[PDB]
Design a protein around this ligand. Structure first.
Ligand code: NI
Length: 341
């Protein structure tokens, strides 16, 4: 049955709650973003109203084949009414079309659901600043002080300079970027832009990108692999074996590969700076691991919560074990004692 952390009290709404069949009492199902864990259970067979961003709607329509009559896309940064209740969608700074949702309940309580997010100081001057938020449903993916990472911009600058140098040294080198869902698109778009190339990819992946309201997209991506010097492949293929094999398939148009595996955190964030990063190499193929995160670091999450000053926090990630919940409660108390709410 549908957990309490996916229900919004005093409404018949739920959030990211598609895997439990019909939820008794639920008149509207919100979807924060198009990642499979969150959409799990949605298909052409779903027949209740789904509320979401425009981008998330395009993906539902085109990739999942949800019937149009059930898709209710809402604009960002706009006060809207849904079944008698005032809501607002905000940019979550996660993957394309991902939202936070603000619910203004009839009793005067205000609730923020972050979905998945990467907290940023620009969220401190949104519509959130205009009133007290009483309850917060929080993306707690990285809620522990060991989780540090560079900014998105530091990582992109590194990727840019690396790719430019390698291809000016060897103009018959190919650049590859691994991917498994939407998100982290700036990695490959910024590499392509500095090399004066379009990004080549499979038909399924091109169909996905075409839904994302990216401006001038037709000038940036193609399905013609041969015409392009940056290619996208599944993350699973980003290894020496998979990369040699792909290199054979391109018809001796390239004699070297430089590949990037964007990841979350792994243990080497705890010593290394982005500037110290060196690849793994076997022969004419080099692989770089780059920590491009679309979740809040511990410090970004803590700052956001200390600013917001919620009366109650409801975690949405790592809630499956008592040890994690207990650990998270401990950090919420510290934050509250330091900041005085
Ligand atoms: Ni996500």
């Amino acid at each position: 049955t549908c957990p309490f952390y996916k229900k919004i009290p005093g409404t018949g709404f739920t959030v990211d709650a598609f895997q439990y069949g019909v939820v008794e009492g639920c008149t509207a199902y919100f979807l924060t973003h198009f990642h499979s864990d969150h959409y799990a259970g949605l298909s052409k067979h779903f027949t209740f109203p789904v509320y979401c961003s425009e981008i998330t709607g395009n993906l539902l329509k085109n990739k999942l084949h949800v019937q149009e009559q059930y898709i209710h896309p809402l604009p960002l940064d706009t006060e809207c009414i849904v079944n008698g209740v005032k809501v607002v969608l905000l940019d979550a700074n996660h993957c394309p079309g991902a939202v936070m949702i603000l619910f203004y309940l009839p009793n005067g309580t205000v609730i923020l659901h972050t979905g998945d997010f990467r907290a940023d100081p620009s969220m401190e001057r949104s519509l959130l600043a205009d009133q007290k938020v009483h309850m917060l449903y929080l993306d707690t993916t990285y809620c522990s002080p060991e989780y540090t990472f560079p900014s998105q911009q530091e990582v992109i600058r590194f990727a840019i300079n690396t790719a430019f140098e390698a291809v000016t040294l060897n103009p018959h080198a190919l650049v590859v970027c691994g991917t498994y869902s939407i998100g982290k698109e700036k990695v490959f778009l910024a590499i392509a832009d500095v090399l004066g190339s379009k990004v080549g990819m499979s038909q399924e992946k091109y169909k996905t990108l075409q839904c994302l309201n990216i401006p001038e997209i037709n000038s940036l991506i193609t399905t013609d692999m041969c015409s392009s010097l940056v290619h996208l492949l599944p993350m699973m293929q980003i290894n020496f074996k998979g990369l040699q094999s792909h290199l054979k398939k391109c018809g001796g148009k390239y004699n070297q590969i430089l590949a990037f595996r964007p990841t979350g955190w792994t243990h080497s964030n705890k010593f290394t700076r982005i500037a110290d990063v060196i690849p793994q190499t076997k022969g004419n193929i080099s692989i770089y691991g780059i920590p491009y995160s679309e979740h809040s670091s511990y410090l970004e999450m803590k700052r956001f919560v200390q600013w917001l000053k919620p009366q109650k926090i409801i975690p949405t990630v790592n809630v499956g074990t008592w040890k994690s919940r207990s650990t998270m409660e401990k950090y919420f108390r510290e934050w509250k004692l330091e900041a005085g709410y």
